[PDB]
Ligand binder design. Structure first.
Ligand SMILES: CCCCCCCCCCCCCCCCCC(=O)OC[C@H](CO[C@@H]1O[C@H](CO[C@H]2O[C@H](CO)[C@H](O)[C@H](O)[C@H]2O)[C@H](O)[C@H](O)[C@H]1O)OC(=O)CCCCCCCCCCCCCCCCC
Ligand SMILES: CCCCCCCCCCCCCCCCCC(=O)OC[C@H](CO[C@@H]1O[C@H](CO[C@H]2O[C@H](CO)[C@H](O)[C@H](O)[C@H]2O)[C@H](O)[C@H](O)[C@H]1O)OC(=O)CCCCCCCCCCCCCCCCC
Ligand code: CLA
Ligand code: CLA
Ligand code: CLA
Ligand code: CLA
Ligand SMILES: CCCCCCCCCCCCCCCCCC(=O)OC[C@H](CO[C@@H]1O[C@H](CO)[C@H](O)[C@H](O)[C@H]1O)OC(=O)CCCCCCCCCCCCCCCCC
Ligand SMILES: CCCCCCCCCCCCCCCCCC(=O)OC[C@H](CO)OC(=O)CCCCCCCCCCCCCCCCC
Ligand SMILES: CC1=C(/C=C/C(C)=C/C=C/C(C)=C/C=C/C=C(C)/C=C/C=C(C)/C=C/C2=C(C)CCCC2(C)C)C(C)(C)CCC1
Ligand SMILES: CC1=C(/C=C/C(C)=C/C=C/C(C)=C/C=C/C=C(C)/C=C/C=C(C)/C=C/C2=C(C)CCCC2(C)C)C(C)(C)CCC1
Ligand SMILES: CC1=C(/C=C/C(C)=C\C=CC(/C)=C/C=C/C=C(C)/C=C/C=C(C)/C=C/C2=C(C)CCCC2(C)C)C(C)(C)CCC1
Ligand code: OEX
Ligand SMILES: [Cl-]
Ligand SMILES: [Cl-]
Ligand SMILES: [Fe+2]
Ligand code: NA
Lengths: 32, 50, 35, 32, 37, 61, 30, 44, 336, 49, 449, 238
């Protein structure tokens, strides 16, 4: 179902958001 | 089994609560040194407490 | 049987008062540590 | 009435090891 | 159900409760990234 | 009027996603907050504008 | 007897633990 | 009834007291302990 | 400080020269626990039969009424009472108070207060000896379990008759009925508690073996090997260097427990947190959160029930269910 | 004592009664070799459950 | 942040590193408040999106939609939901406020001032400044008094709060003349916690509920002003330990008591927690079983007053420990249960035999969904009632859920209070790290024997 | 308290106070008793509470005495909510006949010496013949336990084991009193009543009673003792 597809893409967007912030701060300088 | 679990909990808590100073930091775990020949906890204090 | 309740109430009030006022009576200063 | 077999067994199981341990303790404390 | 102007956003809503569980794990990721100094 | 509300809410969702990704990144970057002040302020302003827009469009849709 | 033996054994155990608490050998070496 | 009963179980009695004597002995005991502590505080 | 009544009382109570430390938690621990000890012993010896289920069907539980140590028990309070606080002064007579189960309420309330003040007294002695205070935190787990089985479970079920009987066969009865109605074996918190006691015995055996094995010679085949030196020297015996090497070589030599403080912290924390978990599992099943229910979870393509080990457990549980309180139920669905 | 006395009950007697129910209600589905096709009326029950 | 080599705290104690950092401590607090409001908004939106209108608001695993519904937002006369727009508005407002709070917490945690005293003396605070800590406590007390008076305003003037005890099965009823009697309110607070009374779980009416809220709001505001304009007395100084850890332990003990207390409200109260929104309590569905079986077996024809059970006590009716006529089953423990469908059936002496025979209401008869399922059983992985039930119905009671969870977290917070109280006392004494090893207290004491 | 002020009390006021176990009294009535108007009556709310519980035990030397006892069950002994008929004649003859209500109460009382005496305090199916000063009769006494009651060993009447399950070698002609019989045959008791403090305006009578009835035979194992129940009764005539 398309509802399940959007649930999965929203889940991946919110799960990957935090580690994206951590890796962006790791590769874009520091202060963490 | 119940007495063994009791002994494990009591021994761990007693040793962790008689740990001596052995350092200046707030974490006592790094205050331990395997090279030194002194006991890491106060058996006299533990005996009097219990 | 009412006097049993009176006696028990007196005993409990006595021990609770000892508890409360003993912990009021400078309990954090009853230590061997310097501070 | 009275289970005299159970009475004898309990009395012997109390008396014999307690007396044995007490005799050992007395002879140990007599000669330091 | 959500109102008719918010019905397509209900699948987005269905994931939102787990974000606080993800936050403490994000803290653990940050500790791993600073190598638990 | 419902379509305008849905587009505004989708824009608010993407702006909030960009803010969640970027605000800790901008803040904790070395010498990055004082140079990304304009873009962060603009993002917060559009976020508040989209929140108020969805709020006022709720009464019409 | 039935209950008398149980009572005697229980109070004997209680007397043993009382003697162990109060009339124990004083602790030496730590 | 076949016997005399306190009949105080329930009814939301304050601190469980159903007669004034219980409240008075509670207050008197607490006041006596407080008086001893007050005249005998600060160690000396 | 020396010529004052409350002063002399305070430095006698807080004195560390007593054989047993009393303290301000002890001034509440000693009377409540002495009361509970006296009433428990007297009730266990000579308690008349008490109607636990509120159905005019008393059970004996006391030695002078014809049972042994294993099957003797201070029986819980009457079901007719509920958790309605029935002390002696709320009874018209001692015989009536005994017939309705007042000794159980007295002993349980005093025991709860006594164990709480025992924990506080453990903290107080740790404070007065210059120690660290978390022995009381470790002791908080058996106190939690006792509270869960004597206070919290009767609160959840609505009657002190649901409390664990103060005995052995009564404890087994409480266990079996609790199984029948909450499926404790299939409760993850209970699995954590079982793993905790099993691992506590495991770690106790491991620690005892590693410390009793890692020695240098100071005790010979006689009482002691003092021929090197007698009592009065600080030259320490023991080892934790070869013991850690043995433990490492035992499996793969990377699960490093070379820190004695970390090892003892693990020994303290594992059974304590697991007993916390199982006590809270009991407290959750008090409000009927129950265990896992996998009855008829496995069905085939046509929908027939395929039997399961969980289904066999269900059959045993319902066999327990139909036996519990044979005469205490008037209605089909067991809710109270 | 409980055989000659309809009043004498202990928690041990309760446990014995519980064990009887465990056996009776568990054997039929526990041991398929025994082929225990026991009807429901001969299985023991309390009241209403 | 900082490392262990300077702060002395390991990563698993990292929040201790910001004990003495006022700005970072404030940022952690504001970010955590954003977390709380984010859970409120997200879980509210989840419960609204997963809401089926024909079912009651407890077969769906909803716990906080009943919290809004108790206030009277979108609730019909009998207990129907009417509309979910107030719930949606509450969820969205919480989500936006959580976004604002999370931004503030992240800002103060990352690039905010490290320490507040050097630039913001109004917000700077040392843990030993008793006057400053009482000032902050007074600000929070005034805020909480305003929060309680907000519920009072909603009950009094904004036409809200749902009454279960209203005739016909409850209604959203605007509350007039709340009972501000000091004797009643403090007799509620000083009475026994057992089955006959219940200490705090005894409120049977919104009039007493709102009178107590008036009292608590006025007292909180007055105590806030008092703490703003005072300094702790010397006896309080000698009794308390003045540190940030000791204050945390005091808060932990108080909030653990609150957690246990809320668990007890959830399990027993059916006034502040309406049965139409939270399902039956423990005592009901058990009282309802006896009531419905009584009315069914007298509808067949058998009399219920003269019918005795296998034990000779009464299959349907018996007498309580006090001479009140109660239900005759095993539900004699729950004879103190007060419900909206029981009280018009109940009289001065007992259960009013004549009312049971003639004055039964059809809505009280239809309130058998209380009994049928929904008795607060339910197992951990859902499924039905008792542990021996089969996989038929998907239900666990919300009262069971937020009583079990709240007892668990209340006990954990009592344990945390013990930990922090002990460590605060050891910190103030000077031996939080261990024994000095050259002068231990034990060697200065006489041996016991 | 009379019936007027009992109805004026809420449930919460009576709850936990013991008032709900007390029968109403008559305060504005007259003690003439004979003034009551003759006719056929249908009384309702027939109350019946006891004031003493005395048990007849027979010594093994040959004389008859009752003894006061101590109650083990709390306030569950009253009878409330019963109804029936009274055909009162002009001379004073009555036809008291209880029909239905809470006409029973399981009561356990303790004899001196520590022996538990359970009994079922009933007035069910009682007919009354005599004058207003004193009228007596007989009433049905049920067993105490139903036939579905199981003993501690699971044996019973309608349902049960009817066999010593604990041991497979004891079912001979000595446990017949315990296994084979399992009798639940009802007994009968005799109660004597008296009418005092009659009311004219609303027909409220409140006299005293003395009831004799057998105790519990448990399961038929041992013979029953005789319980003497004295107390007050109350009724409203319409
Ligand atoms: C000293 C000895 C203490 C013994 C334990 C006392 C426990 C109190 C209790 O029985 O608690 C229950 C009471 C509520 O009691 C209920 O109160 C009810 C009130 O409901 C009434 O009113 C309701 C509202 O209208 C409804 O209308 C309902 O229908 C009506 O019946 C009834 O009276 C019930 O019979 C009665 O069960 O709640 C409360 O008192 C809340 C008070 C806090 C309870 C804390 C429990 C956990 C305690 C310790 C946990 C561990 C601590 C550390 C350990 C290590
Ligand atoms: C190292 C690395 C990290 C490791 C971490 C390990 C630690 C934890 C890991 C996660 C722990 C949870 C795992 C299980 C999650 C799950 O399978 O998820 C379980 C459920 C499953 O989702 C749905 O759950 C529903 C349950 O019914 C619910 O809804 C029904 C109607 O639909 C009924 O109303 C019913 O009453 C109601 O319970 C249905 O079964 C649906 O079919 C099902 O899809 O999801 C949920 O709820 C999610 C639960 C949300 C949080 C709830 C927390 C507990 C709160 C209160 C209870 C306290 C209890 C204390 C004692 C224990
Ligand atoms: C309620 C959870 C919570 C909160 C609010 C905090 C908050 C804080 N912690 Mg902490 N921590 C936590 C849990 C939490 N922690 C847990 C569970 C652990 C154990 C693993 C730790 C272990 C720990 C250590 C060891 C340290 C801290 C430190 C800190 C402080 C500063 C962090 C820093 O300077 O580095 C920067 C961190 C980052 C750059 C990564 C975080 C990214 C952002 C802030 C959050 C994620 C993005 C988010 C969604 C943005 C929202 C968008 C917005 C627009 C809405 C800070 C106030 C430090 C401290 O004590 O200060 C001296 C420190 O060293 N914590
Ligand atoms: C007078 C100054 C003041 C005021 C008004 C507040 C107010 C507040 N603080 Mg704060 N605080 C202050 C000073 C102040 N603080 C200082 C000097 C410090 C030291 C730096 C702190 C440190 C601090 C921390 C660490 C935290 C707070 C938090 C909070 C909030 C807790 C209430 C809540 O969220 O629950 C719900 C709110 C209610 C139930 C109230 C209902 C709304 C009513 C109607 C509004 C009241 C209006 C009223 C007329 C105005 C009050 C008058 C004022 C003079 C007191 C609250 C709004 C917490 C927080 O972050 O929350 C976000 C928190 O963690 N404060
Ligand atoms: C006050 C706390 C609380 C309570 C009472 C509830 C209650 C409920 N929730 Mg909810 N929830 C909560 C918090 C709570 N929740 C939080 C904090 C979140 C954010 C993650 C959610 C997110 C959430 C979702 C997404 C859903 C629910 C749902 C539900 C309903 C059904 C729950 C269920 O299916 O089984 C309950 C689940 C469990 C009992 C899992 C047990 C987890 C335990 C606590 C783990 C700990 C064990 C042990 C200590 C592990 C140690 C390891 C550790 C060291 C890492 C129910 C009424 C469902 C629903 O019906 O929708 C409306 C639903 O889908 N909840
Ligand atoms: C609002 C309450 C509160 C607050 C503000 C604090 C604050 C603090 N605590 Mg503390 N604590 C609390 C409650 C609280 N605690 C409770 C309730 C307990 C009992 C469980 C503890 C037990 C505790 C210990 C043992 C220690 C602290 C420590 C600390 C300090 C450092 C925390 C840290 O960075 O660790 C990092 C945080 C983590 C690593 C995450 C914790 C993960 C937990 C253990 C697993 C459970 C999480 C899971 C999602 C929940 C499952 C369900 C649950 C119901 C079981 C800090 C100042 C440390 C200290 O003493 O420093 C002085 C420390 O040693 N606390
Ligand atoms: C640990 C965790 C605890 C978590 C939560 C606890 C929350 C609330 C606990 C208190 C609720 C009740 C408030 C007081 C009411 C009351 O005192 O009633 C007093 C009750 C009521 O007393 C009874 O009341 C009945 C009518 O309701 C009858 O009249 C009875 O005759 C009468 O005895 O009796 C007691 O419970 C005895 C309390 C003694 C407590 C001693 C504690 C000593 C330890 C520490 C003291 C520290 C200070
Ligand atoms: C039935 C209704 C039930 C509800 C009512 C419950 C009322 C409870 C009120 C208690 C509030 C007292 C707070 C003091 C806390 C400890 C202060 C202290 O550490 O105090 C120590 C402090 C150190 O300086 O001293 C001081 O500041 C002195 C301040 C203390 C105030 C003393 C109390 C008044 C004394 C009255 C004596 C009672 C006498 C006996 C009466 C006999 C009747 C026959
Ligand atoms: C400091 C720190 C930390 C913490 C952090 C945090 C805590 C953060 C946060 C934050 C937050 C607290 C956030 C929140 C948020 C929110 C948001 C961002 C929102 C929003 C919005 C939107 C967009 C929506 C929309 C909608 C609507 C309106 C309705 C319908 C549906 C939807 C959903 C669509 C950590 C631990 C990491 C580590 C250490 C450091
Ligand atoms: C709202 C409401 C209400 C009201 C309520 C109230 C009014 C409450 C309150 C209350 C109160 C009024 C409280 C108080 C309190 C206090 C406390 C709780 C305390 C404390 C503390 C402690 C515990 C101490 C300790 C100590 C001691 C003992 C001495 C020394 C020092 C120390 C610290 C150590 C009601 C129900 C009506 C209705 C519904 C709702
Ligand atoms: C409302 C909304 C929103 C918001 C959101 C938020 C509020 C945020 C976030 C976020 C987050 C919060 C994220 C996260 C994630 C996380 C994760 C993904 C984690 C992890 C972890 C792990 C995986 C671990 C690992 C490990 C370590 C490292 C340590 C030890 C070992 C182990 C393995 C455990 C948005 C904007 C979207 C829009 C739409 C709606
Ligand atoms: O009481 Mn002992 O236990 Ca709680 O369930 Mn219903 O009720 Mn009886 O049953 Mn199964
Ligand atoms: Cl049972
Ligand atoms: Cl039942
Ligand atoms: Fe060791
Ligand atoms: Na049964």
């Amino acid at each position: 179902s398309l509802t399940l597809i959007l649930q999965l893409v929203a889940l991946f967007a919110v799960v990957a958001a935090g580690p994206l912030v951590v890796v962006l701060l790791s590769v874009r300088g520091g202060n963490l | 089994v119940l007495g063994a679990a009791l002994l494990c909990a009591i021994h761990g808590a007693t040793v962790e609560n008689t740990l001596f100073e052995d350092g200046d930091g707030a974490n006592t775990f790094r205050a331990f040194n395997p090279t030194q020949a002194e006991e890491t906890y106060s058996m006299v204090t533990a005996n009097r407490f219990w | 049987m009412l006097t049993l309740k009176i006696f028990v109430y007196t005993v409990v009030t006595f021990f609770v008062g000892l508890f409360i006022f003993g912990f009021l009576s400078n309990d954090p200063s009853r230590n061997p540590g310097k501070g | 009435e009275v289970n005299i077999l159970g009475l004898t067994a309990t009395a012997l199981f109390i008396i014999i090891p307690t007396s044995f341990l007490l005799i050992l303790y007395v002879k140990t404390a007599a000669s330091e | 159900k959500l109102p008719e102007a918010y019905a397509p956003f209900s699948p987005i809503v269905d994931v939102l409760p787990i974000i606080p569980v993800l936050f403490i794990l994000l803290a653990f990721v940050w500790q791993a990234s600073v190598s638990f100094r | 009027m419902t379509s305008i509300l849905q587009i505004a809410l989708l824009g608010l969702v993407l702006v909030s996603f960009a803010l969640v990704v970027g605000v800790p990144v901008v803040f904790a970057s070395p010498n990055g907050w004082t140079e990304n002040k304009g873009v962060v302020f603009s993002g917060l302003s559009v976020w508040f504008l989209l929140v108020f827009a969805v709020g006022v469009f709720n009464s019409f849709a | 007897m039935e209950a008398l033996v149980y009572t005697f054994l229980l109070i004997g155990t209680l007397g043993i633990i009382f003697f162990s608490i109060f009339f124990r050998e004083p602790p030496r070496i730590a | 009834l076949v016997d005399d009963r306190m009949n105080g179980d329930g009814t939301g009695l304050p601190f469980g007291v159903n007669d004034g004597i219980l409240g008075w002995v509670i207050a008197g005991t607490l006041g006596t302990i407080w008086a001893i502590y007050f005249v005998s505080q600060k160690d000396l | 400080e020396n010529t004052s009544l409350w002063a002399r009382f305070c430095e006698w109570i807080t004195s560390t020269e007593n054989r047993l430390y009393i303290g301000w938690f002890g001034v509440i621990m000693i009377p409540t626990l002495l009361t509970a000890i006296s009433v428990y012993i007297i009730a266990f010896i000579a308690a008349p039969p008490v109607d636990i289920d509120g159905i005019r069907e008393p059970v004996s539980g006391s030695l002078l009424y014809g049972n042994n140590i294993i099957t003797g028990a201070v029986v819980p309070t009457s079901n007719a009472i509920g958790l309605h606080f029935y002390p002696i002064w709320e009874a018209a007579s001692l015989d009536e108070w005994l017939y309705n189960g007042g000794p159980y309420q007295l002993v349980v309330c005093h025991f709860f207060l006594g164990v709480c003040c025992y924990m506080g007294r453990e903290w107080e002695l740790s404070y007065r000896l210059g120690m660290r205070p978390w022995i009381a935190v470790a002791y908080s787990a058996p106190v939690a379990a006792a509270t869960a089985v004597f206070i919290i479970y009767p609160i959840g079920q609505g009657s002190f008759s649901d409390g664990m009987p103060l005995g052995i066969s009564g404890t087994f009865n409480f266990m079996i009925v609790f199984q029948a109605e909450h499926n404790i074996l299939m409760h993850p918190f209970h699995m954590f508690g079982v793993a905790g006691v099993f691992g506590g015995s495991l770690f106790s055996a491991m620690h005892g073996s590693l410390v009793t094995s890692s020695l240098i010679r100071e005790t010979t085949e006689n009482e002691s090997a003092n021929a090197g030196y007698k009592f009065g020297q600080e030259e320490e015996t023991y080892n934790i260097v070869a013991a850690h090497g043995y433990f490492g070589r035992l499996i793969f030599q990377y699960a490093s427990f070379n820190n004695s403080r970390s090892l003892h912290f693990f020994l303290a924390v594992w059974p304590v947190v697991c007993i916390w978990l199982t006590a809270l599992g009991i407290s959750t099943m008090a409000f009927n959160l129950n265990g896992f229910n996998f009855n008829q979870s496995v069905v085939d393509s046509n929908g027939r029930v395929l039997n399961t080990w969980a289904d066999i457990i269900n059959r045993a549980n319902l066999g327990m269910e139909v036996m519990h309180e044979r005469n205490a139920h008037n209605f089909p669905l067991d809710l109270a | 004592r409980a055989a000659e006395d309809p009043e004498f009950e202990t928690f041990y007697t309760k446990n014995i009664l519980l064990n009887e129910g465990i056996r009776a209600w568990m054997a039929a589905q526990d041991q398929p070799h025994e082929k225990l096709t026991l009807p429901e009326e001969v299985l023991p029950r309390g009241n209403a459950l | 942040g900082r490392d262990q080599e300077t702060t002395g705290f390991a990563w698993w104690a990292g929040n201790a590193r910001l004990i003495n950092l006022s700005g970072k401590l404030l940022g952690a607090h504001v970010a955590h408040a954003g977390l709380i409001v984010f859970w409120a908004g997200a879980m509210n939106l989840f419960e609204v999106s997963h809401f089926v209108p024909e079912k009651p608001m407890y077969e769906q695993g909803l716990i906080l939609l009943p919290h809004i519904a108790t206030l009277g937002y979108g609730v019909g006369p009998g207990g129907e939901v009417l509309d979910t727009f107030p719930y949606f508005v509450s969820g969205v407002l919480h989500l936006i406020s959580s976004a604002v709070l999370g931004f503030g917490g992240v800002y103060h945690s990352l690039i905010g001032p490290e320490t507040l005293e050097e630039s913001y003396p109004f917000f700077g605070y040392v843990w030993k400044d008793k006057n400053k800590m009482t000032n902050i406590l007074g600000y929070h007390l005034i805020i909480l008094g305003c929060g309680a008076w907000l519920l009072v305003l909603k009950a009094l003037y904004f036409g809200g709060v749902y009454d279960t005890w209203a005739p016909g099965g409850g209604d959203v009823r605007i509350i007039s003349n709340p009972t501000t009697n000091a004797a009643i309110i403090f007799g509620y607070i000083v009475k026994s916690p057992f089955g006959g009374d219940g200490w705090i779980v005894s409120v049977d009416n919104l009039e007493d509920i709102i009178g107590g809220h008036i009292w608590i709001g006025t007292l909180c505001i007055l105590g806030g002003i008092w703490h703003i304009y005072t300094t702790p007395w010397p006896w309080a100084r000698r009794a308390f330990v003045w540190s940030g850890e000791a204050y945390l332990s005091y808060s932990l003990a108080a909030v653990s008591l609150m957690g246990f207390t809320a668990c007890c409200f959830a399990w027993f109260n059916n006034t502040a927690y309406p049965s139409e929104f939270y399902g039956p309590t423990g005592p009901e569905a058990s009282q309802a079983q006896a009531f419905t079986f009584l009315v069914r077996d007298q509808r067949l024809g058998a009399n219920v007053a003269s019918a005795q059970g296998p034990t000779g006590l009464g299959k349907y009716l018996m007498r309580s420990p006090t001479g009140e006529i109660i239900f005759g089953g095993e539900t004699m423990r729950f004879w103190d249960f007060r419900g909206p469908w029981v009280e018009p059936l109940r009289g001065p002496s007992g259960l009013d035999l004549v009312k049971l025979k003639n004055d039964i209401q059809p809505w009280q008869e239809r309130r058998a969904a209380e009994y049928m399922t929904h008795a607060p059983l339910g197992s951990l992985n859902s499924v039905g009632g008792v542990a021996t039930e089969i996989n038929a119905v998907n239900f666990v009671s919300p009262r069971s859920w937020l009583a079990t969870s709240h007892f668990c977290l209340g006990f954990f917070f009592f344990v945390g209070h013990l930990w922090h109280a002990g460590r605060a006392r050891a910190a103030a004494a000077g031996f939080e790290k261990g024994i000095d090893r050259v002068d231990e207290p034990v060697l200065s004491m006489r041996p016991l024997d | 308290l009379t019936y007027d002020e009992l109805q004026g009390l809420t449930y919460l006021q009576v709850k936990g106070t013991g008032i709900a176990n007390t029968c109403p009294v008559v305060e504005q009535g007259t003690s003439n008793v004979r003034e009551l108007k003759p006719g056929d009556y249908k009384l309702e709310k027939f109350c019946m509470e006891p004031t003493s519980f005395t048990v007849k035990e027979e010594d093994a030397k040959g004389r008859e005495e009752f003894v006061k006892t101590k109650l083990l069950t709390r306030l569950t002994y009253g009878l409330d909510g019963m109804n029936g008929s009274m055909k009162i004649n002009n001379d004073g003859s009555v036809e008291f006949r209880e029909d239905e209500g809470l006409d029973y109460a399981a009561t356990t009382v303790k004899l001196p010496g520590g022996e538990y005496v359970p009994f079922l305090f009933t007035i069910k199916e009682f007919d009354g013949k005599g004058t207003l000063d004193s009228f007596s009769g007989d009433f049905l006494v049920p067993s105490y336990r139903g036939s579905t009651f199981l003993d501690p060993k699971g044996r019973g009447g309608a349902t049960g084991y009817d066999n010593a399950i604990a041991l497979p070698a004891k079912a001979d002609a000595d446990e017949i009193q315990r296994l084979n019989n399992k009798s639940y045959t009802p007994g009968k008791g005799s109660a004597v009543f008296s009418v005092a403090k009659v009311d004219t305006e609303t027909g409220e009578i409140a006299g005293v009673f003395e009831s004799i009835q057998p105790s519990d035979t448990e399961m038929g194992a041992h013979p029953a003792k005789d319980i003497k129940i004295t107390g007050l009764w109350y009724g409203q005539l319409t």
